[model samples]
Structure formats: structure tokens, C-alpha cells
Target: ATGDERFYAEHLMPTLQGLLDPESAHRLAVRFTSLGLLPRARFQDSDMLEVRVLGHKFRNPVGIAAGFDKHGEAVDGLYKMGFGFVEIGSVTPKPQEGNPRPRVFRLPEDQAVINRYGFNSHGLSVVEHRLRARQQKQAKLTEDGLPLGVNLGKNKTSVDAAEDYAEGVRVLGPLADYLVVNVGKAELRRLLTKVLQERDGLRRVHRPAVLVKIAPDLTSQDKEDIASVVKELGIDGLIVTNTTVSRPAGLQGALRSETGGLSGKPLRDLSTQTIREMYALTQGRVPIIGVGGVSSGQDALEKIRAGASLVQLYTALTFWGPPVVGKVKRELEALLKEQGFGGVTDAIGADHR
Candidate 1:
């Protein structure tokens, strides 16, 4: 909004990063944004950036991916930052502390992060309360047209994975604009079937769209099988992908070998590769929210060309700040015009031709 990259990115951000450990800095971020301490974004989106997907009209295709606001905190504040939508959590059924301390590591050299947060959540009840409270205040809040997506994750030790996801849908479905089932290959059909039942049973007028987030480290067969299940189940969409556990060979970051899912520049191509495969596997019938390493408009354009209807980013927010959101969209809009596309939808899956 300010277009003052030097102050925030070069001075303020580096100072903040230097002062606190990664997790502490993240906590402070959530606190400040939730408290509305940051300036609201003032950029006006171009008509070409509008996108219709998952039964909702997105002002733009760029969204904040899940894992940023893990507890459903900071929704309005993040919306103020100019993301078309805001996703919160891979929240578990119950409150869990997630992995041990120092669970997140920064890779400054590569602008990457490795985190095994393991679904540390304040549980459904707390998040439900927050969202419900927000909804109650919606009339008083500014109308930003920002859709909210809730990403659901199972408990680390929970035996019944289906039940956990089903529980997520039953409780959070009515509140969320869309719901993300963030787990791997097994039991997708059973889990989604149960989730759909819960979603359909909800009394709300606008039933939340159900989407599944897949991992980037999938085999060809695994991808095909997931696509088959998605088609069979008539799922709403696919988020391609989650962070990757497999570290690429040439990562120069000091913490590159540290355990946990890796995200950022190192993950850029792997996610796009998955997006291409999943787009073809699903025959472009399903919407894919391309995520992982999206920092610039060019990266987002690549995902759109690779068949993503929308794109999300989290790690980039760590590197830059709210300014990054406007930056990405502005660059995307310029690129879209140069590419001769009338709207974002026109360029989706262009490579398949």
C-alpha cells in the first residue's frame, strides 16, 4: 500500500527477524495483526483480477494460505492486508501443543522455512467461538468481500481420521466459506463421504465448499488414485499442495536438512509440477489452489498457466510483509494484460492447449 519496501522489508522486517526467534516473531505477528496495529491496504484491484471459484466470487486470485493464522485469529486484519481470502489452521479436533519448541527453522539464504508444527491448534471449540464472534460482528465490520477458508487437520494420535474430519465439517462447515481437508492419500473416499454428509446436513444457506489439500511429494500412482477419488467423491476443489518433506539436493540454506515440511523458493517448481499433473489428471474439471513458494506475480502466473484457479502463499509473507500482497497482485495484473488475457479465468490451464 505504502510502496515503501525499504522501510518495512529492508529495515523493519530485518530488525524484527533479528530480535525474535522464528516462532516468537510469528506469535508477535499474529498478535499485532489481530490487534489491527498495521496499516490497512489501500490498493484497488483491477477488474481483470476478479475470479469466480468454489461458489464464491474472489476479488483476486491471491489468498493467504493456511498455517499463517493457525487459530482463526487475525481474519479481519489479514483481510485488511488485501488478500482476496484468508485461510486459517490445519486445526485438530482438540487443543494440542504440536511439536517441541524450536520446531520452526529459517533458511535465510534460500528464503525457505522448515516447520513441523504438527497441527498445533486451540481446537474446534475455540476457533468456532472466534469465528462465531466475528460473524456476530460482521454487520459492524467493514465489507471487504474476503472469503474465509478453514483448513482441518486430524489429531497426531487420533486413530479415527475420518471421524476427526467429519467432526471438522459438522462444527466448522457453517462458518467457513470453504473447508480444506489437509491430509494424505489413505481413506479419502471414506473421509470425504463422511464430510460431505456432514456438510450437506448443515442448516446453513451457503454450505461451505469442500476442498482437499494434497502433498507435493506424491508418486504418479498416488496422484492418479487421489484424482480418481476426487472425481468419484465430487469434491469441490484441490489445494495443490501442502509443504514437502523431501528436501531438494541443492538447497543452500543452513537449516535445509532440518526435519519438517519445507516451503519457499525451494518448493516453487515442485508445487507447480504437482499442479500440472493434478490439473491434467482431473481434466481441469476441478479447481486447484496452487500454493508453495508463490512470492511474485510471475510465480502466480506460472501456477495459473499450470491449471490453478487460485494461488496462495505463506512463506513469502515471512520474507516481506503485507506490501507483498499488493505487489503480487499489481505485477499479476500487468502480466495478465501483457499476456492478452481479459481476465484471470482466461489464462487458467493455458498450457494444456
Candidate 2:
């Protein structure tokens, strides 16, 4: 691999630093929005693609996955980049610094990232305010509406994890088109156990959709238990996986030793298997948002055939950049045509055997 750090130190860090600066982030967002307003800047040539899931309509099926714009600060910019939808935040109830710096690392050889940013966001209040502002802006732009999903997570130090999740659901439900609950390890069993206890609070929330985000490392029994709990709680859907902590064998090099979740190519097979298990258990009763290791149009199609009605990605974008969404979409459309499949919906679960 050719070694280069110019983009990392110059472009990426400056962009992130600008985002970290509250005032600068706001201005950058506004400038990005203005760019979207210009002629020839629109993704209008993109087919009139629309899909309904969880009682919401997405202009397209591809979404900018969570963690890119954690504070709901740049949904407009992302939406303008031809994404069908965008999710923001893994926001906690209170503001707190995340894990120590040097938490996010790149493993170019492996095409992976290991981050323990631990949901370092501006907290729920800031996210709520920003969501409200964005919603109002969207209302002004188009009546068709753009779907915005909110990802809610608990603070690392929270003793009452259920209350933390409940608060997230209760507070953000009205603001979100869909609510995604990201469950982490360490105290995950305890946190999920609490979520089970307060299922009613989540269900009672006004939002039409509530989904649980699970890890890909789950066993067959784990899938069964999770699916059963989801059915019991009346959850609208399940985000088939989050990043994985397990490192597959045969990885060589320094970055392999980096700590945090492993994603990208290493995760494809495991994530697909998890989706298959979840789909089998749910019997298509609940929608599943298939994610992880999707790097191409064929990969997206594979996820769909394996039972993902909709899908999301982050690592592919990290490795290939934002244009990867359009590339994947084109490939998916070609694959659909080749298979004589009419559209994405027709391709769902084609390989369930």
C-alpha cells in the first residue's frame, strides 16, 4: 500500500475540527445546505425510487449509516450527497467526553476501523434541538419529506441503563422518524435485560418505528432469544448488526492489534449469516435493516437476498468514499435487471434457502 497521510492530517482533521467547533460546524452545515440549493447539484436523475418501511417512506433505500454525523449536525449535507436517508446520533442523555483520544484507528491493509469513540455526542438536548431545526428546514424544502432516524445509546457510566434507554426513546421518539436502540457489550446483558423490563415505555412512544441494534457475533441461540424478545416487545424492526469485537483469524500487521470493533470485509460473511438467522426467526414479520461489510452493489444485493428489506453502511464509505452509494445503487439496479428482478423489493430474501 502506498503510504500517504496528507488527507488524514489536512482535509479530514480540519473538517472534523471545524465540526467540533460549535460555531464553525453550524456555519459549515449552512454552507453545505446552500451548495445543495444550486442548479446541477441535485441528484434528480436518480430514479423516482421510493420504499416504505416501518410506516415511513424513504426516497431511496440507501442510508448514510450512524456515527458519521453523531450530533445531527450535517443531515442536510448527507442527504444532498444522494443518500436516500440519514441517521444521526448514538446520543446519550447527558453530555460527556468519550473514551480518551487516539480512540479511532485505521487499518488500511485490512480495510477496517477500530473505534471506541463510545458515542461521543453533544447529548440528547443538543441533538433534539438540531433535529427540530432540521425538520423545520426540511418541511420548508419539500412536502414529500425525508426520513431521519435517530440512534440512541447509553452513557458508559450509567448505572440505570434501562432508564437511559427509556429516556432516549421517550425524549427522541417524537422527533425521530424511527428510533434505533444500539446495545453495547460489557454491561449489554444488563442493559438489554432492563430494556425488556421497560418494553412498554418504548412501545408507548409515539414514533411508529422502534428498532434494536444488535451485534454480529451473536450465536444461533442468541438470535432466537433476540428475535423472541423483539416480537414480544412489538419492536418495529431490527438493525441486524453493529460492528464486531471479534477478530477473524489470519489478519497480519500492526493494525490488527488495534482495539475496538472490527468492520469491513472481515465482517461480510458473519453479518450476512446473522441477517439470515434473524430473517428466519422473524419470518418476515418484522423488518430488518441489514448492515455491515457492504462494499459494493453485489454485496447490497446479497444482503437483500439474505432477507434485508433495507440496508445501511459505514465502512464502505470509509474505504471508498461517499460516491460509493451511487456506485452500489447502479450495481444493484444492474443486478436486478440481470436477475429479472423488478426492483429491490422483489429481490428481498431471494436466497433464503
> TM-score winner among the candidates?
1
Q: Provide the TM-score for each candidate, comma-separated.
A: 0.96, 0.82
**What Cα-based lDDT does every candidate model obtain?**
0.88, 0.71
Least accurate 10 contiguous residues by lDDT in model 1: 136-145
Model 2 scores a C-alpha lDDT of 0.71
Instruction: Report residue 229 deviation for candidate 2 (angstroms).
Output: 1.2
Please provide, for model 1 over 1-353, each residue's C-alpha lDDT reduced to its tens digit, 9 standing for 90 to 100.
25465467777777778888999988988998888887557678888998888877888899999998999989988877888888999888999999998899889788899998878999999999999887855423313456889999888899898899989888888888899997545566777889888899987764889998999998898899889999998999999989999999888888888889999999999999999999999999999999999989999999999999999999997788768888889889989999999989999999998
Q: What are the per-residue Cα lDDT tens digits for candidate 2 across 215-288?
A: 99777677777787777657788897788999899665467777787878788878888988898899877888
Question: How many residue pairs of model 1 clash at the backbone?
Answer: 0
lDDT of 2 at 7: 46
Candidate 2, residue 282: Cα displacement in angstroms equals 0.6
**True-structure Cα RMSD, model 1:** 1.9
